Design a protein around this nucleic acid. Structure first.
Ligand SMILES: [Mg+2]
Lengths: 89, 88
DNA sequence: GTATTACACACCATGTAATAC
DNA sequence: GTATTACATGGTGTGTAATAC
């Protein structure tokens, strides 16, 4: 059904702090268009965004980027067929 | 700590097994141009390839994809100017 | 003050096909 | 048998600016 994207987690941290999407965008050096797209799931949490987010929300850049990597794998593992691929010895 | 391209590890695994580029390409479902580009470091190890690579080389898609995430971040650690952001 | 989104643009991974050993 | 690369192309992340509250 409807799945959860890593933008929802950025949003809950901003709501808990009373920081709007427009100040958060200006803070990380990005226009508010991208933050709205990010938080809604329209676009992906790129590695460069995981670097600014890490400097604003206080975790490792790998942490925020991992959320997008797992999101991509959860989507693609249902789509890519691996029956024809041979495991080597 | 040294961050090589993910293709260098894939290249050494294929060399140790006798598998060529075209053979490995045919196994996972991509053209030999893709495997060449991947091994030379010209292109990135996408999440799609990480699933195909783990089916042939036998680790996890998270493993192969995390090698590329560490490469991409390390290249961007030195370029993104983070001295203007305030921590909450 | 706040958020959403079409548009133009730029970046990039991949198949095709020609190249070379 | 092997590997490499220019080209066309589809995909997509982002700023600009419009729209709306
Ligand atoms: Mg084509």
């Amino acid at each position: 059904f409807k799945v959860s994207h890593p933008g929802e987690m950025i949003a809950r941290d901003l709501e808990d702090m009373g920081v709007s999407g427009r100040r958060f965008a200006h803070n990380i050096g990005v226009t508010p268009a991208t933050v709205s797209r990010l938080l809604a799931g329209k676009t992906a949490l790129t590695p460069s965004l995981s670097i600014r987010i890490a400097a604003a929300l206080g975790s490792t850049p790998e942490f925020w980027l991992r959320l997008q990597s797992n999101y991509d794998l959860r989507q693609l593992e249902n789509q890519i067929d691996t029956s024809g691929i041979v495991l080597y010895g």
